[PDB]
């Protein structure tokens, strides 16, 4: 926060309004909420912000942010970009023509009724589902057909009391489609809600084949890329006088740590054999216990489903029947799970094992399953002392749960704890020995018995981050005579 000439009387006195102005802009979704006592509602001038009073400090901040018709320019850029996406993918989607309605220059900031933005002309016919949320999957493109689609973009500026944009998009859709003033040139379309104060987005409407992934991707790219939005965000930052400190502006995991679950599964080492020779010259090996690794890094949670060789008796060949077990086991997992730890997308090391669990997971068919394009060193979780001996001497196949994020979620992110983890896992993967000596540098570094890793400080933590990554690079060089990020993280 923001570390001659001779002035007239009223310059050498009277307060400075600028720090008051920026305190109000910062605290502004609270100072300007919707649930008030007495207060008469009013629309900011050329936009769709509501005030419920007269707070001149706040009104001045907000007005000077949205100068020069920035609100409509935002509406116009967002509609153009959607158009262009359809300009391009006409082919796969059967779009014969794309119709951008020549704009009412006030459609963006009239808030109780709506023209439409995009008119979609099929080639032949679309069969179309019932409406659901842009975050809901199972869609039955059966109910009707048409050549006419409309698409709506509605911008709001939410506040502390009300910034859920799912229910916003739902209510605006239901209402605006069953009202008697909004002229929709079809009985079918979609509504896309942007929340400019919180940079949120979603949509509700009647869908057809392709629409869900198409929009999902186009929206997530606009919200990041669009140039109007960039001018918005930039007037906001400069009216706050906020600066970043990170250089470099700090792939899936920007999708992955989200409040929606994603699991990481390792079943490459559930079957292992330990080899020692006979008096006979033949090096005979004894099978040993294993473990399915299920990970949630937005939590630091492992389910360790240890496999017993109780199942090595009369099952013919190891690997594919092991695929089969892992499948039915994760199925039982989802069965036993409660309604706030239910998984949403699960990525396994074995891209060859998706199919058996694919089929087995139909009792819980909401599961986006995938094989991970970035392997993460849970195979290096065979190395540690607690987990290993646990598995090794267990007798009955079983479940355990660890929080690898020992105390970290108090003073780092799930982001940062996941990154640091990747460091540690790959460090056991690559050396295990320089790993021991790097992560226990001080002679009397300790671990609390419920920890996977010691009790450090931030100083040596940053030092050892650089150290472990130095090691990963050193060893890549030794055995081979964006890149650093992705080698740290996983596959390439």
């Amino acid at each position: 926060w923001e570390k001659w000439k001779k002035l007239t009387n009223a310059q050498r006195s009277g307060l400075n309004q600028i720090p008051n102005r920026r305190f109000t802009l910062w605290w502004s979704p609270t100072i300007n909420r919707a649930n008030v006592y007495v207060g008469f509602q009013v629309q900011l001038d050329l936009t769709g912000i509501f005030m419920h009073g007269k707070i001149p400090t706040l009104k001045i901040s907000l007005i000077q942010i949205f100068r020069a018709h920035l609100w409509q320019k935002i509406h116009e850029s967002i509609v153009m970009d959607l158009c262009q996406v359809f300009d391009q993918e006409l082919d796969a989607l059967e779009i014969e023509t794309v119709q951008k309605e020549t704009i009412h220059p006030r459609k963006s900031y009239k808030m109780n009724s709506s023209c439409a933005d995009i008119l979609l002309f099929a080639s032949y016919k679309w069969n179309v589902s019932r409406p659901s949320l842009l975050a809901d999957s199972k869609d039955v493109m059966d109910s009707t057909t048409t050549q006419k689609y409309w698409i709506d973009i509605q911008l709001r500026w939410g506040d502390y009391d009300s910034h859920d944009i799912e229910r916003y998009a739902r209510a605006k859709f239901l209402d605006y489609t069953t009202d008697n003033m909004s002229i929709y040139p079809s009985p079918t379309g979609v509504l896309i809600a942007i929340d400019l104060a919180y940079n949120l987005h979603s949509a509700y409407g009647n869908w057809f084949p392709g629409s869900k992934p198409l929009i999902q991707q186009a929206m997530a790219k606009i919200m990041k890329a669009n140039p109007a939005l960039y001018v918005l965000r930039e007037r906001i930052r400069k009216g706050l006088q906020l600066y970043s400190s990170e250089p470099t502006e700090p792939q899936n995991y920007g999708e992955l740590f989200s409040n929606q679950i994603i699991w990481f599964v390792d079943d490459t080492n559930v079957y292992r054999v330990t080899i020692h020779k006979t008096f006979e010259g033949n090096l005979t090996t004894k099978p040993i216990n294993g473990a399915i690794f299920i990970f949630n890094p937005r939590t630091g949670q492992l389910f360790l489903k240890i496999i017993h060789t109780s199942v090595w008796a009369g099952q013919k060949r190891l690997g594919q029947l092991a695929k089969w077990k892992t499948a039915e086991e994760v199925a039982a997992l989802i069965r036993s799970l409660p309604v706030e730890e239910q998984p949403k997308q699960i990525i396994v090391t074995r891209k060859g094992m998706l199919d058996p669990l694919e089929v087995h997971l139909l009792d819980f068919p909401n599961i986006v399953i995938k094989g991970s394009e970035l392997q993460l060193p849970f195979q290096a979780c065979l190395k540690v002392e607690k987990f290993g001996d646990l598995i090794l001497k267990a007798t009955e196949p079983q479940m355990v749960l660890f929080n690898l994020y020992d105390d970290w979620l108090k003073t780092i992110s799930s982001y940062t704890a996941f990154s640091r983890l990747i460091l540690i896992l790959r460090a056991l993967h690559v050396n295990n020995d320089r790993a021991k000596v790097i992560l226990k540098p001080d002679k009397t570094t300790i671990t609390e018995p419920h920890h996977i890793w010691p009790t450090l400080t931030d100083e040596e933590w940053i030092k050892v981050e650089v150290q472990l990554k130095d090691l990963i690079l050193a060893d890549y060089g030794k055995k081979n005579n964006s890149e650093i990020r992705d080698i740290i993280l996983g596959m390439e």
């Binding site: 014969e96 023509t97 002309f121 080639s123 032949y124």
Partner: protein, 52 residues
């Protein structure tokens, strides 16, 4: 829009295919000008080795 079902539409629904309704009637002109024939035929046997 098959070479079979193209005159199955009129120059309204013919142009309804690719939504180019200033060109639909010219399209139908091209179709109806492409020589296309039907035919009817009767077969009656003379003997087990001949059918006229």
């Amino acid at each position: 829009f098959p070479f079979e079902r193209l005159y199955d539409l009129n120059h309204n629904e013919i142009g309804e295919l690719i939504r180019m309704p200033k060109m639909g009637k010219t399209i139908h002109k091209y179709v109806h000008l492409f020589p296309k024939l039907e035919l009817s035929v009767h077969l009656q046997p003379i003997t087990r080795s001949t059918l006229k």
